[PDB]
Swiss-Prot record, chain A:
It comes from the Bacteria. It catalyses: FADH2 + NAD(+) = FAD + NADH + 2 H(+). Keywords: Antibiotic biosynthesis, FAD, Flavoprotein, NAD, Nucleotide-binding, Oxidoreductase. The lineage of its organism: Bacteria, Bacillati, Actinomycetota, Actinomycetes, Kitasatosporales. GO terms for molecular function: FMN binding; riboflavin reductase (NADPH) activity. It comes from Streptomyces globisporus. Gene3D superfamilies: Electron Transport, Fmn-binding Protein, Chain A. SgcE6 provides the FADH(2) required by both the halogenase SgcC3 and the monooxygenase SgcC through free diffusion. Accepts only NADH and FAD as substrates. This is NADH-dependent FAD reductase. The gene is sgcE6.
Amino acid sequence: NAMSPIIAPPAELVDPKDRVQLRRVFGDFPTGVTVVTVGGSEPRGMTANSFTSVSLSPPLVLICVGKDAVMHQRLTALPTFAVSVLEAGQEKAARHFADHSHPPGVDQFDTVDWVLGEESGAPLIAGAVAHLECAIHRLYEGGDHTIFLGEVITATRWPAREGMLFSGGRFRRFAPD
Amino acid sequence: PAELVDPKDRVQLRRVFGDFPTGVTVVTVGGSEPRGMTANSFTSVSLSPPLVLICVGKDAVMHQRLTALPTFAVSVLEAGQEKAARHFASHPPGVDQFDTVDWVLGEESGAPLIAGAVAHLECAIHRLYEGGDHTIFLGEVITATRWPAREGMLFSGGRFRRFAPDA
């Protein structure tokens, strides 16, 4: 379009030092929503959108976990985890495991339906689009986060289920097609 | 019903990887021979320092460029840019990809930024990590620009999808 340049909507220049502004550009890339879980005497879960498939052979995925998260230390202590890719109607689960809202000290899994993952020993979220059980193969430096590279040990999927969406800091849904 | 997946079966594993929806970006580099590659393996990593990562296949032409150049750019594609997405998905290493699409030079990266994007990020390569049949490129964001009015393109189950209007 001839005028697209001068007609373009407001462009925001983003200073990467400006944490608020930077969060906004990071939020511009749409993603699904996962719950990463780990086992142990007190299992834990964390809603995460940083999940990324990495390699087919070998089968690898990654997740980025904040050093400020309880999950960070749980993962370094126990090098196996599960990923539950949430379905569109699972906002209850998404909220439950987000924003460090249910801290350690009491059971974090008493309000969400889950099944034990045999290979990971971690709770898997019932009703999810897919479950992946992974073994942590590498830890990579990621600034205020750590990049955990996982090797996929087993996985299950429900083809009739469609994933939740997250973008611009909000839950979204697909249009049919 | 539940479909069991054997991660050693490439076809079945692709299906499960496809179950996590993502956006779509074009990663670009400048230099002598500018290059672009459509990628959805992009994720944000860190706020301070500001870091992002992309995974690039070891056999991709872009893998050679990124390994050699200090900087790169990421354009997050807007909902109506399926054409651009397809365009950088073919070209021999000697055929210009940019002569038929709209772009602007990013001053910091030296790399073409795709016009009409939801966002532009210009990055400096920070680390390379092993990722099986891919390499993980970790970049530090030097500058970025966003157009809040614009909505990202979606990719899921192996096809392009769109947002339902926000209720």
